[PDB]
A paper describes a structure:
Apo-[name] crystallized in P21 with four molecules in the ASU. There are four [name] chains in the asymmetric unit, arranged as two dimers (B/D and A/C) with the same dimer interface seen in the [name]/FAD structure but different crystal packing between the dimers. The monoclinic crystal used to solve the apo-[name] structure had been soaked in Trp, but there was no electron density in the Trp binding site. In addition, the Gly10-Gly11 peptide bond is flipped, so that in apo-[name] the Gly10 carbonyl O is hydrogen bonded to the NH of Gly14, and in [name]/FAD, the Gly11 N–H is engaged in a water-mediated interaction with the FAD pyrophosphoryl group (a similar flip was previously observed between the open and closed conformations of Thal31). In the apo-[name] structure, all four chains are missing the η3-β9 segment, chains A, C, and D are missing the segment between β16 and β17, and chains C and D are missing five additional residues at the C-terminus. The four apo-[name] chains have Cα rmsd values ranging from 0.33–0.51 Å with one another and from 0.78–1.11 Å with chain B of the [name]/FAD structure. The closed gate explains our inability to soak Trp into this crystal form, but it is unclear why the gate remains closed even though the flavin binding loop is open.
Flavin-dependent halogenases (FDHs) regioselectively halogenate aromatic substrates using halide ions, O2, and reduced flavin (FADH2) at physiological temperatures in aqueous solution, making them a green alternative to conventional synthetic methods for aryl halide preparation. To better understand mechanistic details that limit FDH catalytic efficiency and potentially hinder their application as in vitro biocatalysts, we investigated the halogenation activity, substrate scope, crystal structures, and ligand binding of the Trp-5-halogenase [name] and the Trp-6-halogenase [name]. HOCl generation occurs >10 Å away from where the Trp (or other aromatic substrate) binds, and the HOCl must diffuse through a tunnel toward a conserved Lys,29 which either hydrogen bonds with HOCl and positions the Cl for reaction with Trp by EAS25,30,31 or reacts with HOCl to form a chloramine, which in turn transfers Cl to Trp by EAS. Our results show that flavin cosubstrate/coproduct (FADH2/FAD) and substrate (Trp) cannot bind simultaneously to either [name] or [name].
Author numbering: 0 to 36, 43 to 144, 162 to 261, 266 to 514
The structure:
């Protein structure tokens, strides 16, 4: 009753995360074939579980992939010029039923909520490793992630999967053939014949050769709510070893800084209706400085949105073929991992229960729609309205339900029951952090706090300061930690 063969079309992170995960889940019990013809990438909290599922320890794969830790995103110039705050991978401290951020909002202890309420922002400022020299994490309350070279990770996972039995075909796909039912029959390669199988995984990127082209599945654009449709990127050496991604708001988008161990990936995500590619490139080069003078710039047109369905007949799209949003909250690898994890969970047998597709498609659509709402909030709640781009960010049509949630958030800070009510990766603490940092909404603390005992909250504020000072004195820098791993 089980399927016998999976064909993954396309390599990169999408294809080789799929192939490697299938071998960890199913072993030799099903055949996997991948057909395929450095970029710094950031990740989201759940990626720790992907490597754990494959049995890979950080000390094994991080050195081979130029990887560093990502404890937070540093948001620069979204509220006002010269202002920054951290969005940390750090879950809430709750005191007598109220988050510490609620207590802070009632009586702010400084200009920086992220300094008073969190530990991780200070760790980023001090270039800290999250692991001590003794190998232990400093602490989960800290669901951190990584920066890595996506090409090196793809090669690492390729070696992992091929060593465990994945068949690797190096060739171009010239055509996709459908049978009389409209299911994928086979893929025509340039010089290796036609590859057939039970299940086809479309990892062909924006081109979406199987799902979007051969099967002609409609694609739902997000461009009306999120206008950024383009990017220009370059790479420079490390001078920068800060354990966070930086997102610096610009006149028509934002610039990412993604620190690898000895390289920095940087790029300008922008809206082509507001600025030209050559002006985006000029801005990016000036931002990076003299190190970018001779670096080669890569220009990218983005397909922003999601497929209407992600599993159609015997085809499942994974990666940019399934959907994409700008990497403002580093969701690319997250979308891939969610798609693979849910594919294993909803894996079909030879009877191809249509209910599996229905559930799978709803889960993916809810993840992507929920992330879309979260990103819209980034531009809506950003206080800056200095030009037409940042004014328009407040007048675009909002996704269903968001207008009501925005009103709830200006009564009490976001919690589990006032955010997008389906799984979409991000937890309520991320909403609270972004709203406080972006500064554009009229937020209010809970009136009940004026009747509560303040001693527990005041104790917690003092503890955060004492712990941040202890960690500043004890933790090594990322460089010091990685130098110790190299010596070991």
């Amino acid at each position: 009753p089980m399927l016998k063969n999976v064909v993954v079309v396309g390599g990169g992170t999408a294809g080789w995360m799929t192939a490697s995960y299938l071998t960890a889940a199913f072993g030799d019990r099903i055949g996997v074939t991948l057909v395929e013809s450095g970029v710094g990438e950031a990740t989201f909290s759940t990626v720790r579980h992907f490597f754990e599922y494959l049995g890979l320890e950080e000390k094994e794969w991080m050195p081979a992939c130029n990887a560093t830790y990502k404890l937070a995103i540093r948001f620069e110039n979204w509220r006002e010029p010269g202002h920054h705050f951290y969005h940390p991978f750090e879950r809430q401290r709750v005191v007598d039923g109220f988050p510490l951020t609620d207590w802070w909002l009632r009586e702010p202890r400084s200009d920086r909520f992220d300094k008073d309420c969190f530990l991780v922002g200070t760790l980023c400022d001090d270039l800290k490793s999250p692991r001590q020299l003794n190998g232990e994490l400093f602490e989960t309350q800290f669901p951190y992630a990584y920066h890595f070279d996506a090409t090196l990770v793809a090669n690492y996972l390729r070696d992992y999967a091929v060593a465990r039995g994945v068949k690797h075909v190096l060739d171009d796909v010239q055509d996709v053939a459908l049978d009389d039912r409209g299911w994928i029959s086979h893929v025509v390669t340039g010089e290796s014949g036609n590859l057939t199988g039970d299940l086809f995984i479309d990892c062909t990127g924006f081109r979406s050769l199987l799902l979007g082209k051969a099967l002609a599945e409609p694609f739902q654009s997000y461009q009306d709510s999120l206008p950024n449709d383009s990017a220009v990127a370059l790479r420079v050496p490390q001078d920068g070893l800060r354990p966070c991604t930086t997102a610096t708001a610009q006149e028509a988008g934002w610039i990412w800084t993604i620190p690898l161990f000895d390289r920095i990936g940087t790029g300008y995500v922008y809206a082509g209706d507001y600025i030209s590619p050559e002006e985006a490139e000029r801005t990016l080069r000036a931002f990076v400085g003299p190190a970018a003078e001779h670096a080669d710039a890569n220009h990218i047109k983005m397909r922003i949105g999601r497929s209407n369905r992600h599993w159609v007949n015997n085809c499942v799209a994974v990666g940019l073929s399934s959907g994409f949003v700008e990497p403002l909250e580093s969701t690319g690898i997250f979308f891939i991992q969610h798609a693979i994890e849910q594919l294993v969970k909803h894996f079909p047998d030879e009877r191809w229960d249509d209910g599996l597709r229905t559930a799978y498609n709803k889960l993916v659509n809810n993840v992507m729609d929920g992330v879309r709402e979260f990103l819209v909030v980034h531009y809506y709640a950003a206080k800056r309205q200095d030009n037409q781009y940042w004014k328009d960010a407040k007048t675009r049509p909002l996704p269903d339900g968001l207008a009501e949630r925005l009103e709830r958030w200006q009564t009490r800070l976001p919690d589990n029951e006032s955010v997008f009510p389906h799984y979409h990766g991000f937890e309520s603490y991320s909403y609270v952090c972004m709203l406080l940092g972006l500064g554009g909404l009229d937020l209010k603390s809970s009136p009940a706090l004026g009747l509560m005992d303040a001693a527990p909250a005041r104790h917690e504020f003092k503890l955060v300061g004492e712990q941040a000072a202890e960690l500043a004195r004890t933790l090594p820098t990322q460089y010091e930690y990685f130098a110790q791993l190299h010596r070991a």
